[PDB]
């Protein structure tokens, strides 16, 4: 009944919920597990480029500095990953 | 080799590319076809709420007013759809 694009959006909300606490936001250790579980090939390409994405991702995406990642900040992180994959689709090297 | 989350991101880039012109941006008639093809259940829920999402989506998401939707603006639209589905996941009515 749902399209592939709709199930994809629903899958990202289901993913977010695997990592949220009772406040519906993601703490730092949880974010890093989410990245390692769901974006391992993304992370691996950075580490080759000499980049430890995990060292800064929490602090960079915690825009309101409340030491949580909320849904809006989580979407911003997915956007970032999407931008990298789009660049790759055009012959760019991973994690630039 | 790619995770489900990675294939989902790749699927959204593949979707974007179904609708772009030679300049790598999406014109209005194309955006509306993309919505109707990929988010029909989203759109249907709006039309019930008396909302014609298609009447304004192009103009609302064309942030730089160049009459194209570029990748960054397309991600912003997916974010919007994601926000609605997240709200739904918490008992909110579709298209609020
Ligand atoms: Ca925050
Ligand atoms: Ca534009
Ligand atoms: Cl939540
Ligand atoms: Cl493009
Ligand atoms: Zn939630
Ligand atoms: Zn696992
Ligand atoms: Zn492209
Ligand atoms: Zn079709």
Author numbering:
A (entry chain A), B (entry chain A): 1 to 96
Article excerpt on this structure:
S100 proteins are a family of small, EF-hand containing calcium-binding signaling proteins that are implicated in many cancers. Hallmarks of the S100 protein family include their small size (~ 100 aa) and the presence of a canonical (calmodulin-like) EF-hand motif and a non-canonical (S100-specific) EF-hand motif. While most S100 proteins share moderate sequence identity, S100A7 and S100A15 are 93% identical in sequence yet intriguingly display divergent functions. Intriguingly, however, S100A7 and S100A15 serve distinct roles in inflammatory skin disease; S100A7 signals through the receptor for advanced glycation products (RAGE) in a zinc-dependent manner, while S100A15 signals through a yet unidentified G-protein coupled receptor in a zinc-independent manner.
Similar to S100A7, S100A15 eluted as a stable dimer from a size exclusion column (SEC) indicating that the seven divergent residues (R21GD24GD27ET83AT51IN52H and D56T – S100A7 residues are shown in italics and S100A15 residues are underlined) did not disrupt the multimeric structure. S100A15 crystallized as a monomer in the asymmetric unit of the monoclinic cell with the dimer generated by crystallographic symmetry. The S100A15 structure was refined to a resolution of 1.7 Å and displayed an overall root mean squared deviation (r.m.s.d) of 0.661 Å2 over 96 Cα atoms relative to S100A7. During the initial refinement stages of the S100A15 structure an 8 sigma difference electron density peak was observed that overlaid with the bound zinc in S100A7. Accordingly, a zinc ion was modeled and refined at full occupancy resulting in a B-factor of 30.52 Å2. Thus, it was apparent that substitution of Gly24 in S100A15 for the zinc ligand Asp24 (S100A7) did not abrogate zinc binding. To complete the distorted tetrahedral geometry of the bound zinc in S100A15, a chloride ion was modeled, which refined to a distance of 2.1 Å from the zinc and a B factor of 25.4 Å2. While water molecules are commonly observed as labile ligands in zinc coordination sites, we elected to model a chloride ion using the B factor as a guide and based on the fact that chloride was the dominant anion in our buffer. A second zinc atom was observed in the S100A15 structure (at Glu36), which was not observed in the S100A7D24G mutant. We expect this is an artifact as S100A15 WT was crystallized in high concentrations (50 mM) of zinc while S100A7D24G was crystallized in the absence of zinc.
